[PDB]
Amino acid sequence: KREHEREVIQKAIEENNNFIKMAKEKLAQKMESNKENREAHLAAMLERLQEKDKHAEEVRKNKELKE
Amino acid sequence: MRECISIHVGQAGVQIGNACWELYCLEHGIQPDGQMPSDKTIGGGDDSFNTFFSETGAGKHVPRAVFVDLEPTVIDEVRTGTYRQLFHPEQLITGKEDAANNYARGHYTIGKEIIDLVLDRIRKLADQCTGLQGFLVFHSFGGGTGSGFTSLLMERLSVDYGKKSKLEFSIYPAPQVSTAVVEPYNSILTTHTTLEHSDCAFMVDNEAIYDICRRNLDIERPTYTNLNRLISQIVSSITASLRFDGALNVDLTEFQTNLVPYPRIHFPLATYAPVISAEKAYHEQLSVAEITNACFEPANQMVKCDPRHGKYMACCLLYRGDVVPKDVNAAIATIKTKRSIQFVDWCPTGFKVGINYQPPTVVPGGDLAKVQRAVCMLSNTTAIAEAWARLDHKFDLMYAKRAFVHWYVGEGMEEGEFSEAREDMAALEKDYEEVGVDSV
Amino acid sequence: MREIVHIQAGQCGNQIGAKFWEVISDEHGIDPTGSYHGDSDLQLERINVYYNEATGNKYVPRAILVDLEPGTMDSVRSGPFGQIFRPDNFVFGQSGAGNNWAKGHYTEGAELVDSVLDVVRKESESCDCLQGFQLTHSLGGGTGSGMGTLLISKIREEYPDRIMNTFSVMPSPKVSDTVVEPYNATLSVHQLVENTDETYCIDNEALYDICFRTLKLTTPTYGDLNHLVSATMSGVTTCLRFPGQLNADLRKLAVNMVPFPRLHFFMPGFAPLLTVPELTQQMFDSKNMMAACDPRHGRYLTVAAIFRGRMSMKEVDEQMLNVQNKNSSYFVEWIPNNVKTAVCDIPPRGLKMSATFIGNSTAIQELFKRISEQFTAMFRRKAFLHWYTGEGMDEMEFTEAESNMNDLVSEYQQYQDATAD
Numbered sequence A: 001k002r003e004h005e006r007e008v009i010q011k012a013i014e015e016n017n018n019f020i021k022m023a024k025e026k027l028a029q030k031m032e033s034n035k036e037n038r039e040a041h042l043a044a045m046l047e048r049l050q051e052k053d054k055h056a057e058e059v060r061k062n063k064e065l066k067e
Numbered sequence B: 001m002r003e004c005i006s007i008h009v010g011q012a013g014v015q016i017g018n019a020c021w022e023l024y025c026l027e028h029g030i031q032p033d034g035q036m037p038s039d040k041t042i043g044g045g046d047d048s049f050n051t052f053f054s055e056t057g058a059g060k061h062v063p064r065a066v067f068v069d070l071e072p073t074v075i076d077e078v079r080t081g082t083y084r085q086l087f088h089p090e091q092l093i094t095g096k097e098d099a100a101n102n103y104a105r106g107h108y109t110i111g112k113e114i115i116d117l118v119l120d121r122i123r124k125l126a127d128q129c130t131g132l133q134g135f136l137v138f139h140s141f142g143g144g145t146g147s148g149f150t151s152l153l154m155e156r157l158s159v160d161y162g163k164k165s166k167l168e169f170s171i172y173p174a175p176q177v178s179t180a181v182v183e184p185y186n187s188i189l190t191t192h193t194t195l196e197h198s199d200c201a202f203m204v205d206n207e208a209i210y211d212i213c214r215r216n217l218d219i220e221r222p223t224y225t226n227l228n229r230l231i232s233q234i235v236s237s238i239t240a241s242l243r244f245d246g247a248l249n250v251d252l253t254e255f256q257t258n259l260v261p262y263p264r265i266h267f268p269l270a271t272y273a274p275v276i277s278a279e280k281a282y283h284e285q286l287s288v289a290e291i292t293n294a295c296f297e298p299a300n301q302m303v304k305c306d307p308r309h310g311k312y313m314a315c316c317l318l319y320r321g322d323v324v325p326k327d328v329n330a331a332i333a334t335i336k337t338k339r340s341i342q343f344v345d346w347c348p349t350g351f352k353v354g355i356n357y358q359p360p361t362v363v364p365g366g367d368l369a370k371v372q373r374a375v376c377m378l379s380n381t382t383a384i385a386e387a388w389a390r391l392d393h394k395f396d397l398m399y400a401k402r403a404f405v406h407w408y409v410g411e412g413m414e415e416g417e418f419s420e421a422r423e424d425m426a427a428l429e430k431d432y433e434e435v436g437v438d439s440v
Numbered sequence C: 001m002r003e004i005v006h007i008q009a010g011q012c013g014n015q016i017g018a019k020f021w022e023v024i025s026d027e028h029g030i031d032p033t034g035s036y037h038g039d040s041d042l043q044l045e046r047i048n049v050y051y052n053e054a055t056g057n058k059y060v061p062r063a064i065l066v067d068l069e070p071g072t073m074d075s076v077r078s079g080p081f082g083q084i085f086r087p088d089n090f091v092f093g094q095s096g097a098g099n100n101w102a103k104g105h106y107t108e109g110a111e112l113v114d115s116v117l118d119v120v121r122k123e124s125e126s127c128d129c130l131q132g133f134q135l136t137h138s139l140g141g142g143t144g145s146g147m148g149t150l151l152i153s154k155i156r157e158e159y160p161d162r163i164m165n166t167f168s169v170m171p172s173p174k175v176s177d178t179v180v181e182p183y184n185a186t187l188s189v190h191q192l193v194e195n196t197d198e199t200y201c202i203d204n205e206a207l208y209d210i211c212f213r214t215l216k217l218t219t220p221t222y223g224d225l226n227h228l229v230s231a232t233m234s235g236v237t238t239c240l241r242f243p244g245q246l247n248a249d250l251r252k253l254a255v256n257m258v259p260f261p262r263l264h265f266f267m268p269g270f271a272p273l274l275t276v277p278e279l280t281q282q283m284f285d286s287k288n289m290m291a292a293c294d295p296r297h298g299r300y301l302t303v304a305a306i307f308r309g310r311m312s313m314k315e316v317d318e319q320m321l322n323v324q325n326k327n328s329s330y331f332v333e334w335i336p337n338n339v340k341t342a343v344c345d346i347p348p349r350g351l352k353m354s355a356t357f358i359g360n361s362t363a364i365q366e367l368f369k370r371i372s373e374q375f376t377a378m379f380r381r382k383a384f385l386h387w388y389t390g391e392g393m394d395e396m397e398f399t400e401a402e403s404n405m406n407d408l409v410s411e412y413q414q415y416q417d418a419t420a421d
């Protein structure tokens, strides 16, 4: 009986720690995946605007090479 | 000991906080400067009101409370207003930029900037407690901060405080006072995220409260101030067991044992009576039988749904004021041979009763009559699932077209968080159906 | 404090901008010197959104004034409230664009853009917490059109997480004869669809028709048209300017109003051009739209309605419910609760009560179809194309702008035809 009582309290500690562990890890994966996605959505927007400057350079270039 | 910490999140959480704390101060004779003449033990004590107020050496009684909003203008009103001496500046936390009605911003983009600071302020309240019982979190479902920040905060509290109980007062959205088209999205995302982190959640349907104000109090066009005064009366009834003691007082935790048969089935229906104007209360005393009867009138519920069309798994009656068990039992016996009260076959049918002797208070300039006796019924019914069915339907209409979804994806969220949150809600609706089926 | 940075570009831009600042300065009770001589605490509470504070209790518009033509700059400065704008915030060239988008976007405008950015940056860095930007311009000219759209692209690169809001004046043969205007408008639309969050379509067509047909003014001046523009603009910014619940900032407005990132072109409405039922009936009337589209020819995705004046909230609520009930076919059923209502206490100048309407309606396609028809009648004949190729532009760029604008039309048609089932 004493050994059984020891096992029950250990089970309870183990499950409470597992819940804390797993909540800590799911949250950290979520905050990481989110930072990455936000960043990739911004990098893509900035790249699209980068291609607009590259097209405007090329258009001014195309003007001057005509007289 | 038995301390409780209140966390008020976002506009709705904060404004409801103001109303609750003003009312608690009147209930205990605490002045706007924190002084309480009747408290003879200066700088500490283990009295009933100490679960909610700590005490400074100078005789100040201080809410065990944190107010948090991602924007400053609602909290600035607490800072410059009537009860500003009540709170230490560090209990009132503001950012600069709000979540703009977006869960992703409340949970990630903006909320991650302020979350460590909030948990540090919470830690400072917790460290002053000799036997912390747990947390009461106040927030809207619909707001960006109320949804996203609250869900972030609940997750983090599970990490920092383990299984320490967390109770929610959650403002369920209504078209009459709502401010965003995307409230159904925010509601489903927060509900899915906090479901495992919460022990008990009291949903307050803004439409039920709006209706009660219009119908019972003859207010043409209720404002937040009207709604909040009534909400605070209901919150006060629930916490009254923690803040007062008496012979027939029954602790909230003991009601909770009866109210939560499975961890996911944790959303009690609250019904409150009497809600009556000064004009109509005059010369008309509502008896114990009258107020108990009013608890089974669906127009008096805090959530719109019909318990006559589902099943009960628990029934609790929290009386306050001039009420004795004899009258309660007589009123209960009458209702049982006259009302549509069907229990699931796996739970016993006895009502659980607590009585606090301290009668309700009202705030100066408010709409409710001062009554001698009041009751809050907390029931666990399968009918609460109707409130989910309505929100889920709204969510499905917009989500089938991905309307507004780009606002969340732009902030770093994936569509897979949406379908996942929605599936959990479908499984919840299913859980509520299964608990109402008879046993083999 | 959530600051907005105001930019006005070109003639139209600058004309409507000055009108805007006159109306709102009056409403917030500030002088042409920049002093507060009002009466209500509500006028100053959110003053920071549009005004910087310099000491001496002086309020200075957070306004940047831009043109390639040096003329209109004198016009603003000699105007009423010309005294109020920061001298440094004026940025002029001397080579007016001559209604050539390419000159505005690629050449002369691109030479001037960098010293506009200098002023934007200066205004922005002084901000407690910047919401974003509003540009007033026309799409028919060359400066407002081309350089305005270049400014957008350039600001966006440096403030990608800020809201870009435009008040865009759409061209009409009823008001201007400059034949190249369909070209300028199409090239503008191509830019606006990719790079703004919200665009108020101010249609010159509709402004004409209100002056002629409703107001009964036989030939209307730019000044008559602009009286409508300023009353609209006052209306749609009310929620930003006065303490309040709904749509109180540019991001929250965008989140309520923009279900899909490309469909961000709004028809504003005004009333009167009264009882609560009539105001409500009138603001939903085709004859009250600042865009020349019949709402009854499409469906509403989202609507914001703003009531101004002392009135019954109960009655506004019932009348708004009433209008949705009776006109339910004209609201998409798959976005629930898509009409929102704010009531502000302060009426505008001279009115006891007013109603301003902002609609995201699939009926806006009618405006884009008009521009597309006028564009196609030029382009298949390659008419006046040398004005553009003359600055280095490819024919491909014209083809792309047109078919993107066509894509936007069919997209508005797609969500019009969509059902819940």
Ligand SMILES: Nc1nc2c(ncn2[C@@H]2O[C@H](COP(=O)(O)OP(=O)(O)OP(=O)(O)O)[C@@H](O)[C@H]2O)c(=O)[nH]1
Binding pocket: B009, B010, B011, B012, B013, B015, B016, B069, B070, B071, B098, B099, B100, B101, B102, B106, B140, B141, B142, B143, B144, B145, B146, B147, B171, B172, B173, B174, B177, B178, B179, B183, B206, B224, B225, B227, B228, B231
């Ligand atoms: N009962 C009640 N409901 C409120 C109150 N304030 C807002 N709400 C409701 O809460 C929802 C809007 O969320 P808010 O709490 O205002 O938003 P927030 O949490 O401040 O989030 P953001 O402002 O987006 O950062 C709507 O359903 C409102 O009707 C209030 O004082 N009382």
Ligand SMILES: Nc1nc2c(ncn2[C@@H]2O[C@H](COP(=O)(O)OP(=O)(O)OP(=O)(O)O)[C@@H](O)[C@H]2O)c(=O)[nH]1
Binding pocket: C009, C010, C011, C012, C013, C015, C016, C068, C069, C096, C097, C098, C099, C100, C138, C139, C140, C141, C142, C143, C144, C145, C169, C170, C171, C172, C175, C176, C181, C204, C207, C222, C223, C225, C226, C229
């Ligand atoms: N409603 C209104 N429309 C105007 C006003 N001024 C010009 N427009 C319209 O603006 C279009 C022409 O654009 P402008 O602003 O004049 O051109 P700009 O941006 O100054 O460009 P450039 O003159 O080529 O340097 C035409 O469709 C005009 O009808 C005004 O004050 N009110």
Ligand SMILES: [Ca+2]
Binding pocket: B039, B040, B041, B042, B043, B044, B045, B046, B055
């Ligand atoms: Ca004490």
Ligand SMILES: [Mg+2]
Binding pocket: B010, B011, B071, B098, B143, B145
């Ligand atoms: Mg807020």
Ligand SMILES: [Mg+2]
Binding pocket: C010, C011, C069, C096, C141
């Ligand atoms: Mg000009």
